[PDB]
mmCIF file of C-alpha atoms in Angstrom:
data_model
loop_
_atom_site.group_PDB
_atom_site.id
_atom_site.type_symbol
_atom_site.label_atom_id
_atom_site.label_comp_id
_atom_site.label_asym_id
_atom_site.label_seq_id
_atom_site.Cartn_x
_atom_site.Cartn_y
_atom_site.Cartn_z
ATOM 1 C CA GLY A 1 -21.173 22.802 5.147
ATOM 2 C CA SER A 2 -23.811 21.328 2.941
ATOM 3 C CA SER A 3 -23.899 17.663 1.955
ATOM 4 C CA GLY A 4 -23.806 15.206 -0.777
ATOM 5 C CA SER A 5 -23.503 11.656 -2.096
ATOM 6 C CA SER A 6 -21.012 10.339 -4.593
ATOM 7 C CA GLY A 7 -18.171 8.000 -5.190
ATOM 8 C CA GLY A 8 -15.073 9.491 -3.341
ATOM 9 C CA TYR A 9 -12.962 7.373 -1.181
ATOM 10 C CA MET A 10 -9.922 8.434 0.950
ATOM 11 C CA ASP A 11 -6.237 7.582 0.732
ATOM 12 C CA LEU A 12 -6.572 7.232 4.436
ATOM 13 C CA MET A 13 -3.083 8.613 4.717
ATOM 14 C CA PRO A 14 -3.896 11.009 7.758
ATOM 15 C CA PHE A 15 -5.350 7.605 9.157
ATOM 16 C CA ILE A 16 -2.116 5.806 9.106
ATOM 17 C CA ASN A 17 0.164 5.641 12.188
ATOM 18 C CA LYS A 18 3.617 6.370 10.880
ATOM 19 C CA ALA A 19 4.644 5.979 14.452
ATOM 20 C CA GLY A 20 3.732 2.446 14.754
ATOM 21 C CA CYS A 21 4.571 1.420 11.125
ATOM 22 C CA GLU A 22 7.376 -1.224 10.436
ATOM 23 C CA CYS A 23 9.484 -1.635 7.294
ATOM 24 C CA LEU A 24 11.526 -4.767 6.526
ATOM 25 C CA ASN A 25 14.911 -4.666 4.701
ATOM 26 C CA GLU A 26 14.591 -0.799 4.448
ATOM 27 C CA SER A 27 17.485 0.963 2.710
ATOM 28 C CA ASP A 28 19.941 3.216 4.696
ATOM 29 C CA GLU A 29 19.974 6.123 2.634
ATOM 30 C CA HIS A 30 16.293 5.570 1.522
ATOM 31 C CA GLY A 31 13.438 5.348 3.905
ATOM 32 C CA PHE A 32 10.208 3.392 3.452
ATOM 33 C CA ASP A 33 8.175 6.427 4.582
ATOM 34 C CA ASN A 34 9.225 8.549 1.932
ATOM 35 C CA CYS A 35 7.580 6.463 -0.489
ATOM 36 C CA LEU A 36 4.139 7.449 1.156
ATOM 37 C CA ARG A 37 3.756 10.880 0.019
ATOM 38 C CA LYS A 38 3.817 12.006 -3.505
ATOM 39 C CA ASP A 39 6.328 14.754 -2.686
ATOM 40 C CA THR A 40 9.359 12.990 -1.426
ATOM 41 C CA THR A 41 12.127 10.784 -2.070
ATOM 42 C CA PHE A 42 11.730 7.131 -3.363
ATOM 43 C CA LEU A 43 12.375 3.755 -1.476
ATOM 44 C CA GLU A 44 15.193 1.901 -3.207
ATOM 45 C CA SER A 45 15.818 -1.893 -2.304
ATOM 46 C CA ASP A 46 19.514 -2.771 -1.275
ATOM 47 C CA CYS A 47 18.769 -6.294 -1.853
ATOM 48 C CA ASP A 48 15.943 -7.196 -4.170
ATOM 49 C CA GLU A 49 12.003 -7.289 -4.687
ATOM 50 C CA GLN A 50 11.773 -9.002 -1.026
ATOM 51 C CA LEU A 51 10.822 -6.017 1.074
ATOM 52 C CA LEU A 52 7.925 -5.589 3.416
ATOM 53 C CA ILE A 53 5.505 -2.820 4.406
ATOM 54 C CA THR A 54 3.732 -2.632 7.665
ATOM 55 C CA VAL A 55 0.896 -0.136 8.360
ATOM 56 C CA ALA A 56 -0.715 0.566 11.740
ATOM 57 C CA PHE A 57 -4.281 2.172 11.550
ATOM 58 C CA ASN A 58 -5.317 3.696 14.941
ATOM 59 C CA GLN A 59 -8.873 3.054 13.623
ATOM 60 C CA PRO A 60 -10.448 0.299 12.025
ATOM 61 C CA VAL A 61 -11.258 1.123 8.126
ATOM 62 C CA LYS A 62 -12.050 -0.574 4.910
ATOM 63 C CA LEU A 63 -9.483 -1.135 2.243
ATOM 64 C CA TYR A 64 -11.548 -0.685 -1.077
ATOM 65 C CA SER A 65 -8.644 -0.088 -3.034
ATOM 66 C CA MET A 66 -4.744 0.345 -3.136
ATOM 67 C CA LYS A 67 -2.420 2.681 -4.899
ATOM 68 C CA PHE A 68 1.170 0.959 -5.380
ATOM 69 C CA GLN A 69 3.461 2.410 -7.803
ATOM 70 C CA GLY A 70 7.090 3.558 -8.270
ATOM 71 C CA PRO A 71 9.381 5.932 -9.843
ATOM 72 C CA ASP A 72 9.439 7.260 -13.544
ATOM 73 C CA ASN A 73 12.469 4.767 -14.406
ATOM 74 C CA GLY A 74 10.668 1.631 -15.064
ATOM 75 C CA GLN A 75 10.783 0.040 -11.746
ATOM 76 C CA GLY A 76 7.423 -0.970 -10.084
ATOM 77 C CA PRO A 77 5.982 -3.771 -7.836
ATOM 78 C CA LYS A 78 3.691 -6.586 -9.613
ATOM 79 C CA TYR A 79 3.001 -9.448 -7.310
ATOM 80 C CA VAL A 80 2.341 -8.114 -3.882
ATOM 81 C CA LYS A 81 1.139 -10.039 -0.933
ATOM 82 C CA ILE A 82 -1.466 -8.294 1.100
ATOM 83 C CA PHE A 83 -2.105 -9.166 4.828
ATOM 84 C CA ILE A 84 -4.395 -8.026 7.503
ATOM 85 C CA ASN A 85 -5.544 -8.716 11.101
ATOM 86 C CA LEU A 86 -1.808 -9.597 11.823
ATOM 87 C CA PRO A 87 -0.739 -10.566 15.199
ATOM 88 C CA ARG A 88 1.921 -7.740 15.330
ATOM 89 C CA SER A 89 3.717 -7.787 11.903
ATOM 90 C CA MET A 90 4.857 -10.010 8.868
ATOM 91 C CA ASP A 91 8.145 -11.497 8.470
ATOM 92 C CA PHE A 92 9.842 -13.197 5.453
ATOM 93 C CA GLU A 93 9.017 -16.586 6.711
ATOM 94 C CA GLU A 94 5.726 -15.615 7.792
ATOM 95 C CA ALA A 95 4.869 -14.051 4.519
ATOM 96 C CA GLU A 96 5.780 -17.452 2.787
ATOM 97 C CA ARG A 97 4.019 -20.067 4.892
ATOM 98 C CA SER A 98 1.037 -17.896 5.479
ATOM 99 C CA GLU A 99 -1.010 -16.914 2.459
ATOM 100 C CA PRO A 100 -2.280 -13.160 2.040
ATOM 101 C CA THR A 101 -5.704 -11.864 2.160
ATOM 102 C CA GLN A 102 -5.806 -10.891 -1.238
ATOM 103 C CA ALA A 103 -2.669 -10.678 -3.268
ATOM 104 C CA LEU A 104 -2.971 -9.481 -6.798
ATOM 105 C CA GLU A 105 -0.633 -9.102 -9.979
ATOM 106 C CA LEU A 106 -0.284 -5.126 -10.323
ATOM 107 C CA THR A 107 -0.149 -4.447 -14.072
ATOM 108 C CA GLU A 108 1.490 -1.171 -15.756
ATOM 109 C CA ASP A 109 -1.867 0.292 -15.760
ATOM 110 C CA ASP A 110 -1.892 -0.381 -11.903
ATOM 111 C CA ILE A 111 1.425 1.407 -11.136
ATOM 112 C CA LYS A 112 1.152 4.005 -13.568
ATOM 113 C CA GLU A 113 0.693 7.709 -13.032
ATOM 114 C CA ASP A 114 -2.957 7.049 -11.986
ATOM 115 C CA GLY A 115 -2.355 3.289 -11.126
ATOM 116 C CA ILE A 116 -5.185 1.768 -9.037
ATOM 117 C CA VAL A 117 -5.470 -1.813 -7.404
ATOM 118 C CA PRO A 118 -9.021 -2.671 -6.756
ATOM 119 C CA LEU A 119 -9.033 -5.002 -3.630
ATOM 120 C CA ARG A 120 -11.865 -6.773 -1.828
ATOM 121 C CA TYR A 121 -13.507 -4.714 0.922
ATOM 122 C CA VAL A 122 -15.412 -7.966 1.729
ATOM 123 C CA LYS A 123 -12.410 -9.314 3.315
ATOM 124 C CA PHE A 124 -11.116 -5.862 4.751
ATOM 125 C CA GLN A 125 -14.418 -4.858 6.147
ATOM 126 C CA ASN A 126 -12.552 -3.933 9.241
ATOM 127 C CA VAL A 127 -8.860 -3.774 9.477
ATOM 128 C CA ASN A 128 -6.593 -2.257 12.059
ATOM 129 C CA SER A 129 -3.236 -3.560 10.738
ATOM 130 C CA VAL A 130 -2.300 -4.205 7.272
ATOM 131 C CA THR A 131 0.992 -5.299 5.624
ATOM 132 C CA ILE A 132 2.266 -5.493 1.981
ATOM 133 C CA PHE A 133 5.200 -7.864 1.219
ATOM 134 C CA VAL A 134 7.082 -7.372 -2.346
ATOM 135 C CA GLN A 135 7.537 -10.419 -4.184
ATOM 136 C CA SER A 136 8.082 -9.639 -7.995
ATOM 137 C CA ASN A 137 8.028 -6.587 -10.008
ATOM 138 C CA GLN A 138 6.473 -5.630 -13.439
ATOM 139 C CA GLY A 139 9.552 -6.619 -15.671
ATOM 140 C CA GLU A 140 11.151 -8.901 -13.127
ATOM 141 C CA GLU A 141 13.431 -5.988 -12.256
ATOM 142 C CA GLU A 142 16.279 -6.579 -9.722
ATOM 143 C CA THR A 143 14.887 -4.273 -7.280
ATOM 144 C CA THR A 144 11.410 -2.486 -6.813
ATOM 145 C CA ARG A 145 11.371 1.201 -6.161
ATOM 146 C CA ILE A 146 8.506 2.503 -4.102
ATOM 147 C CA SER A 147 7.296 6.350 -4.684
ATOM 148 C CA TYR A 148 3.595 6.401 -3.854
ATOM 149 C CA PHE A 149 1.838 4.109 -1.439
ATOM 150 C CA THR A 150 -1.531 4.365 0.115
ATOM 151 C CA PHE A 151 -4.961 2.783 0.867
ATOM 152 C CA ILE A 152 -7.927 3.886 -0.898
ATOM 153 C CA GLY A 153 -11.385 3.434 0.959
ATOM 154 C CA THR A 154 -13.258 4.703 4.062
ATOM 155 C CA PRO A 155 -13.775 4.219 7.685
ATOM 156 C CA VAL A 156 -16.038 1.739 9.055
ATOM 157 C CA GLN A 157 -17.639 4.525 11.133
ATOM 158 C CA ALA A 158 -16.719 8.187 11.333
ATOM 159 C CA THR A 159 -18.044 11.707 11.835
ATOM 160 C CA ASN A 160 -19.732 14.057 9.397
ATOM 161 C CA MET A 161 -16.594 15.734 8.291
ATOM 162 C CA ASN A 162 -15.628 17.297 4.845
ATOM 163 C CA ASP A 163 -12.703 17.529 2.620
ATOM 164 C CA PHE A 164 -11.006 16.581 -0.807
ATOM 165 C CA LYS A 165 -11.797 19.619 -3.409
ATOM 166 C CA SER A 166 -10.532 20.896 -6.744
ATOM 167 C CA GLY A 167 -8.665 18.387 -9.076
ATOM 168 C CA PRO A 168 -7.659 17.688 -12.531
ATOM 169 C CA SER A 169 -10.134 16.979 -15.394
ATOM 170 C CA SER A 170 -9.994 15.648 -19.136
ATOM 171 C CA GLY A 171 -12.464 15.402 -21.864
#
């Protein structure tokens, strides 16, 4: 159906394997999977900002950016360590001894309604498994609430498909 060239990445949501995903210190009442979609519950930590999020990609894609934010209360992740090409997963000790592939200090503008975290695709040229460990928050809160989480980018090599239409617009 026609064709065109423009800047339009994908959240890779449908490319994530929720069946192979893994969460650390996940609340009992709240799930770490409900914070993946915009329309769902939130993920509240029952300890502190020391939760981990594993992601298993069935196909090797490219992490050009990451959308990490929280609820509308004032609790969002700031200093998060990103890991890729892991042997299977990331723990609390393994996330401390070993350094992340990127790791950035998310700001209020990165965890807002349209917050965006520009990563370095140069390192995620081809990743099959990515993990994110929460260290600190925006205002050093006691806990980080996750509401929306995804990976912006594109597959290293896919077919000629089509999607993503309509959307908001401002002056």
